[PDB]
Amino acid sequence: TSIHQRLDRRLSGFSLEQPFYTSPEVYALDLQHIFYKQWLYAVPVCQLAKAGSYTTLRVGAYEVVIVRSRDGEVRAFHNSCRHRGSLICKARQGQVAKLVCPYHQWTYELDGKLIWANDMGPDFDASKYGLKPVNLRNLDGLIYICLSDTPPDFQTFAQLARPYLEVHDLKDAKVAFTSTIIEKGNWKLVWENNRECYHCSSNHPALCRSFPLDPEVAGVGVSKKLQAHFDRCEAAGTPAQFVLAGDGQYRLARMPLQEKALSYTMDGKAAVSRHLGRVAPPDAGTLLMFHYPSTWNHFLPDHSLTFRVMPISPTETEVTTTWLVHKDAVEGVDYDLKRLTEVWIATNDEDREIVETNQQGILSPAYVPGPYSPGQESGVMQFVDWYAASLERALAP
Ligand code: FES
Numbered sequence: 570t571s572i573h574q575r576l577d578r579r580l581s582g583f584s585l586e587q588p589f590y591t592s593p594e595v596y597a598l599d600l601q602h603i604f605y606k607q608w609l610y611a612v613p614v615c616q617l618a619k620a621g622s623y624t625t626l627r628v629g630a631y632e633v634v635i636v637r638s639r640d641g642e643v644r645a646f647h648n649s650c651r652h653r654g655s656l657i658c659k660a661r662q663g664q665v666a667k668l669v670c671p672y673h674q675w676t677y678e679l680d681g682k683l684i685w686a687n688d689m690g691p692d693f694d695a696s697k698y699g700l701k702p703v704n705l706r707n708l709d710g711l712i713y714i715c716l717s718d719t720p721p722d723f724q725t726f727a728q729l730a731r732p733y734l735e736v737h738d739l740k741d742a743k744v745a746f747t748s749t750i751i752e753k754g755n756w757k758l759v760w761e762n763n764r765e766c767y768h769c770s771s772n773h774p775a776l777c778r779s780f781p782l783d784p785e786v787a788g789v790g791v792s793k794k795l796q797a798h799f800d801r802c803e804a805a806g807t808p809a810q811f812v813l814a815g816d817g818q819y820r821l822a823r824m825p826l827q828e829k830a831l832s833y834t835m836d837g838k839a840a841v842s843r844h845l846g847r848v849a850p851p852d853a854g855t856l857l858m859f860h861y862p863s864t865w866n867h868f869l870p871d872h873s874l875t876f877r878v879m880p881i882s883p884t885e886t887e888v889t890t891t892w893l894v895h896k897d898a899v900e901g902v903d904y905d906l907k908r909l910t911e912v913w914i915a916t917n918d919e920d921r922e923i924v925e926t927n928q929q930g931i932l933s934p935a936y937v938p939g940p941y942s943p944g945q946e947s948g949v950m951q952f953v954d955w956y957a958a959s960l961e962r963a964l965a966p
């Protein structure tokens with residue numbers, strides 16, 4: 570059986586056949602044509618708010634480092650020394666003058682420029698052996714990167730995005746806290762969990778307090794109190810109106826939080842005293858922002874959350890949640906760290922458990938596609954479709 574044959578006979582209303590979540594062949598194809606080629610959420614730029622700052626991430630097999638120059642820009646490169654391929658930047662995050670390879674001290678400037686290589690003598694050009702760039706975009710506070718040499722368009726997404734995102738002044742955030750977890754499920758199944766709300770009824774006693782459960786919010790023609798809600802925000806000059814890429818990849822909507830909620834706290838109250846950005850009115854709700862395959866976010870009036878989805882193996886996905894708060898918000902005065910993060914640390918573990926159980930269930934050669942609820946999983950069907958369509962595009966000539 571071919572992938573082509575499996576993709577052919579895929580009907581729209583169903584979960585995928587086994588090999589999409591279990592086989593290393595699909596994994597390889599997903600790496601190849603989706604993670605290595607599309608735009609990926611990396612890091613907010615508040616991690617690199619000093620020159621020389623750097624951060625590193627692995628994408629599939631690639632070792633990337635994103636760093637800030639003296640010249641002010643954020644460039645990103647392949648973390649493999651051009652001499653014999655050593656990592657340059659080990660530590661997760663940090664600060665240097667130059668990029669100095671710890672094997673043989675070949676030193677690069679912070680724009681790649683190889684400016685010293687030792688006893689490489691007469692035949693040696695250094696113009697050939699600079700660090701390999703990785704295309705990189707700054708999206709009003711979020712660094713996305715792209716490992717293809719010929720990236721897709723970012724700018725159309727960048728342009729729908731800016732207005733909903735400017736009001737957060739994400740450039741003026743600081744990381745309060747960062748959580749990595751690794752879920753023992755396929756990266757696709759992470760997305761399926763997230764693009765529904767449905768299980769949430771009996772799987773998240775915390776979030777629910779604060780986050781909607783009505784499938785309109787995180788589901789896929791606009792209800793009546795919603796335009797009203799979009800309206801109060803836009804009258805206010807906070808963009809709120811639902812918008813959804815025509816390819817299905819990315820989406821914008823500032824959604825009302827569960828009756829009364831102001832933030833993702835136990836008490837529905839602000840998490841930080843010093844709000845981030847200029848969101849307005851107070852109760853504008855939560856900005857949802859997804860972007861297949863790499864991120865979803867919840868941008869509140871008090872603080873911001875990124876999530877970064879990264880695949881590790883056919884049945885493992887690294888999910889990185891980051892808390893963003895104003896740079897002058899003090900821990901202990903302005904916010905309390907526990908209180909700032911208990912809701913979602915709880916919610917992410919509940920999902921993980923859920924994803925992990927699903928994964929296991931799926932590994933049964935007895936598993937066959939069953940049907941999505943059109944009432945609760947229409948947003949899941951939407952992911953799967955963007956997914957299949959992306960694999961077909963990448964696979965023709
Ligand atoms: S391997 Fe990097 S300088 Fe030798």
Ligand SMILES: [Fe+3]
Nearest residue numbers: 762763769920
């Ligand atoms: Fe969930």
